[PDB]
Symmetry: D2
Subunit: 116 residues, 4 copies
Amino acid sequence: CPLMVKVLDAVRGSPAINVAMHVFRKAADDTWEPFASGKTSESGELHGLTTEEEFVEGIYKVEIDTKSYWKALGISPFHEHAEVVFTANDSGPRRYTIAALLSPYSYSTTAVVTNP
Amino acid sequence: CPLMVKVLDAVRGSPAINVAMHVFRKAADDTWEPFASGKTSESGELHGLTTEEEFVEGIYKVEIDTKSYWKALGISPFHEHAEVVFTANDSGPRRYTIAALLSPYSYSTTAVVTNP
Amino acid sequence: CPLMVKVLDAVRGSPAINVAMHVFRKAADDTWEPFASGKTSESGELHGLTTEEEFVEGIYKVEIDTKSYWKALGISPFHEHAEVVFTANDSGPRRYTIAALLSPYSYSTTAVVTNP
Amino acid sequence: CPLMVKVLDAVRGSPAINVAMHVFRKAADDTWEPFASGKTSESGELHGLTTEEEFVEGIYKVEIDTKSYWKALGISPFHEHAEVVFTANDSGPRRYTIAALLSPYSYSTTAVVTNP
Ligand SMILES: COc1cc(O)cc(/C=C/c2ccc(O)cc2)c1
Ligand SMILES: COc1cc(O)cc(/C=C/c2ccc(O)cc2)c1
Ligand code: NA
Ligand code: NA
Ligand code: NA
Ligand code: NA
């Protein structure tokens, strides 16, 4: 899996299910071009975003709609979304797992990068 | 001081000093307009970004240049920046403290929102 | 898996491999009785700590030797260990995943609790 | 003030006020001796726990009573407490700020260590 995103709920102690996100790749003119998208499964995971051959060097942005997640639970959260912006594949292919841990007024994110 | 940002270094156990950041505000055409910028002090804090009169309702983005911070220490980090995007002052004026805790492959951010 | 522990390295962007931990259960006299132990795999995970029938209500402590992990990388960390203390199984069996994200001067921990 | 503790609430976006904590110091027989205790103020801070003369080299544990904090808000949290165990002052006197960011099923802790 070249790119996987895992989202956890720090309030309820559960995967964060049905969390929507879009992935963009920065174009030569500094605009954000659409690249991938999806929503998390019952395990809190989103797999299948891209393929190795399509996922080349670039600056990528994962924009996670955390606000909709909290609003569906009746909570007015702080953030509009959680963003993760990173250069990928600049030393050739790697496998990336982006994890996000969500609370209404806070998020934490980490990456695991593995060489195939 | 209705907006303050504090940045901590989870590797060295210190404030994150001389970290640059830029603040943007979403315009009516949905573009990001420059709003303020600055660098953290020896305490890891950036004060004086705005004023009560200038800090109107809106969607704001703080982009913290974590990449330059790590690179100056000889570390090639994961993220291009740490981002915080939030609606401010929509129920009247509030004071916001944004805190960020930085590691090379992870960051955590929280907000403290107070009604004066 | 009644109890699994997953450990991640926020500095290197990797699983934290070969991290040792012991699990204790609080006895009636408030002392900590040995309960389980192991070290993380190449995936950063420790499975097989207990079985459903052995893992009953109690206060459990997972004591993770983070200091040895950092010292092996030539780093003098802040914490002696990372501890996670929690009541488990007070409403009957659950499955617990404890995750820890490590930096030299910081750790973050979360739990995912699932009803079988 | 060589030891200060600051506690933040990631759910409400506020300092964590009136949070109790106890500090222990490891004795020569490896038992935990009571060292100091207190409660956080309206700013989420606990100052005045110790003095330069009293805060000798040793292994210290801060146990923050997060369980009572969440229960008072009607939340049944995961952890019994948030724990920070560390060696202090082994290379001479330092000033320590321990920060903790709390959610019902997660906590994050960091240290800022300064040489006066
Ligand atoms: C005065 O020392 C301070 C002041 C302050 O406003 C915040 C913090 C810590 C914030 C923080 C963020 C994220 C984390 O994961 C863990 C702590 C420490
Ligand atoms: C439960 O299974 C998993 C799989 C995984 O890849 C990561 C995590 C936790 C990530 C995480 C992020 C931020 C934090 O502050 C603390 C943990 C948990
Ligand atoms: Na390259
Ligand atoms: Na309004
Ligand atoms: Na019960
Ligand atoms: Na010494």
